């Protein structure tokens, strides 16, 4: 047989990336594509926000003065916020903004390990000039989707359901490759749409490792 290799990785944008697997026999390509899509969508290492602590408000429903939208809306916006951490499975992010203007993800104070993937993302709008918001953002590495209720202390602390799903959609198309002297060989191309926290090639590598480990249950390695 022939073993596919990561011949090319193409990034049309930061969020959207394409990976190509050139050598694959007939039938192998489509099976591998479906399996990789399911593995990537099902479970990948993710760093979504877990809990948010607001200095000024106790619970999510009540609102703080000088903030355009509700605290619940702020929490759900923070859920959309995504970060990538290189070495720490746990990290604490602190946000401070004063004065009029939107509170973008760039304004979050960031350590060396943790980096915000999309600074343009906006958490809240501080309309009042004498309005300041201080946030302690807790980010936990996780797998899949965990509801807030499933997990589990201070009254001020707020829990937001986390979604450790770096990839949003995974689309694969099977197109025949052009080998110089070969037949019935097709290249698998996977379109990855992700928030950008996980590298595309790294995500493919992790998915392949997970699938191989699962297969090692069926037959000894």
């Amino acid at each position: 047989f022939l073993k596919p290799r990561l011949v090319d990785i193409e990034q049309v944008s930061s969020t959207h990336a394409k990976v190509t697997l050139e050598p694959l026999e007939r039938g192998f390509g489509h099976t591998l594509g479906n399996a990789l899509r399911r593995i990537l969508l099902s479970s990948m290492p993710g760093c979504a926000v877990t809990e948010v602590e607001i200095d000024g408000v106790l619970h999510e429903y009540s609102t703080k003065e000088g903030v355009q939208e509700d605290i619940l809306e702020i929490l759900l916006n923070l859920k959309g916020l995504a970060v990538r951490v290189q070495g720490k499975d746990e990290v604490i992010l602190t946000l401070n903004k004063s004065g009029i203007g939107p509170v973008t993800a760039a304004d979050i104070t960031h350590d060396g390990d943790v980096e915000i993937v999309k600074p343009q993302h906006v958490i809240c709008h501080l309309t009042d000039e004498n309005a300041s918001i201080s946030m302690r953002i807790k980010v936990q590495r996780g797998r899949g989707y965990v509801p807030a209720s499933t997990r589990i202390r201070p009254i001020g602390r707020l829990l937001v359901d986390a979604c450790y799903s770096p990839v949003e959609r995974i689309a694969y198309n099977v197109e025949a490759a052009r080998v110089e002297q070969r037949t019935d060989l097709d290249k698998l191309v996977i379109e990855m749409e992700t928030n950008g926290t996980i590298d595309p090639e790294e995500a493919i590598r992790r998915a392949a490792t997970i699938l191989a480990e699962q297969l090692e249950a069926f037959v000894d390695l």
Binding site: V57, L58, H59, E60, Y61, S62, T63, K64, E65, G66, V67, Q68, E69, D70, L72, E73, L76, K79, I100, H125, T127, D128, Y145, P147, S149, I155, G156, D161, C163, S165
Partner: protein
Amino acid sequence: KPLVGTGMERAVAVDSGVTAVAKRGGVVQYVDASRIVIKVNEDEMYPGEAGIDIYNLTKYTRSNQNTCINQMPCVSLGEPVERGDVLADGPSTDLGELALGQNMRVAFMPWNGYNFEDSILVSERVVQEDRFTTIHIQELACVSRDTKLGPEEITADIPNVGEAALSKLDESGIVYIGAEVTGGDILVGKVTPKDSSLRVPNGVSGTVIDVQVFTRDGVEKDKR
């Protein structure tokens, strides 16, 4: 917003009382989640005592059907607002358009019988992005009743209860505002004369938005 709509959604939202519509058109000098302030235009404002209009949006409050009513501001600072214009989006309202539900991709096909005749199959993505997560506000009332053998106390101390449950309550015997409680927990401590502390119904799990206590004239109000 409904991607496919009649076109009367705007009329319904405007005519409904939930939507806060500007009495007099003008520029918005200040917008906030709690309140929206409009600087009235010179032409539309009265010659005398017109001032500038202020609107107080009602925050999350219980309904007769136990659904949250929340006016979220629909305009930004410095955004002009015309006469008879929607200021903030009420419940099930988006940009002055009545938006009862969340629309999403729908595929018509049998799927291994999970949608048998009228059943509906829903993707995990729907739960993940909280499209149909609906805030439900339930009000629980515990009343101190004058009774024989002495009135029932509102004290925190209760016979034969765990200290962990009492920890959520305050010193005066009322749960802290903003605290998280689950089924079976005691919200306010009440003792029968000689036990009667109000408790969360089993299964119900939520956070207390606010606690309001009403006291008769002539009887001392507690610390909380």
